[PDB]
Design a protein around this ligand. Structure first.
Ligand SMILES: [Mg+2]
Ligand SMILES: [Mg+2]
Lengths: 133, 130, 133, 133
């Protein structure tokens, strides 16, 4: 119920010579779906005040996707850890799941030079976007 | 007349300088050409593709940033015999940031030669001439 | 050992605003490192005769990478299945393992419309490049 | 005088038409500029970056393909006060396939303005002047 929803229009440049969306495009669309999450950690989205660092990703390529039809990225929180969070995410096209992903990010405080227990205000915000399939 | 395409910049589109990287700009211009490609190839199928770029010009007027939407405006400047010239701009925060021209030819991948743009495509393109 | 080695020069457009190589670049570099495997399946690298379809990937981001120094992609065959294979792969910079990956491809025969068991001749040649960590 | 950069094309750099996508050509041109960036900024630190592009043009002469290396030739066509014009070509199979001209300025981010190229950089640039027919 609580996931973020991001509609994207595929581009010719995101295909490859096989005629489908290229596999390296999927992490690009998944990162696009994390936008609202990034915004919770860095409200002005300034790279001066950037906090989010990926440490792991996994993607299952379930069905091929095509240039010419929109896709929808669903992005939710599978686990809120201490200094990390594990995202669950899916890409759909034509109402069919085509890619499923998980990613783990660490909230890194560059000012203090250490991973930072996610502040409480953020945890509350994140709890209302939990998605556990 | 012109097409309007709203895009949400991505972190991967910036570089270490902290702005949108110059190579993103042509990617965004190509995205604004979508409705043009559709006039040439209505089902956007690659087996029926007929567009080949021959020239591109880009003026980078102002820096763009991750975190705010940009808008691509794309229109036809010239419909030539085999080529067409696209005039195109990208705006962020109500400011023109990039201005572009690109030239494509109508291309027949079956015979390997550029080909005159068909009357019925010219007809469809004429609405979108600046 | 027996894995493939691919030296790559990072590009400015591959970094992001945080100032390191962006995470979406790593799967692009891994794919570049699979070049000799693709050639085994499609000797002329023609897309009309393409067969390699990715079905899954995972990446561990061990250390940050930077524009300004080359990287080395090491790509080995971890497993040769029937219709699929598993690739184990790493990216090093400055002599430090910065990313570790696994990917699974299927040999998809676009002519017969379904997955193809890997032909005996490719199987023998793939065996020349196995690497299990 | 010119720099020479050999690049191995990647599957992700093609599109569904079966050839290298036009948006890859500026990415390859930016890679050929690497040693020019180094003249401005020896250690390629983003903290000390100076170059901002103001204009680019590309002539696409012949289509390029995945599966054969390409070579980028890059030289300085003119050194202005605050700007320089770079002339660049990309070759595949011994044939010129793209020609480019780009204009960068030396930019001060601390003051937010282009500024005269300093004498010590100008001295370096003069050695890489390339002005073809
Ligand atoms: Mg592509
Ligand atoms: Mg980038």
């Amino acid at each position: 119920n609580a996931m973020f929803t991001t509609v994207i229009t595929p581009r010719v440049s995101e295909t490859d010579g096989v005629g489908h969306i290229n596999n390296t495009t999927v992490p690009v669309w998944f990162e696009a779906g994390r936008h609202e999450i990034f915004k919770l950690f860095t409200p002005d989205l300034s790279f001066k005040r950037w906090r989010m660092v990926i440490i792991r990703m996994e993607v299952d390529y379930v069905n091929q996707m095509y240039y010419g039809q929109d896709v929808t990225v669903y992005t939710g929180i599978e686990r809120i850890g201490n200094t990390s969070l594990t995202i669950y995410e899916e890409i759909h096209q034509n109402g069919v799941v085509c890619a499923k992903g998980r990613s783990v990010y660490v909230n890194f405080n560059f000012d203090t030079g250490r991973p930072e227990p996610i502040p409480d205000d953020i945890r509350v915000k994140l709890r209302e976007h939990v998605w556990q399939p």
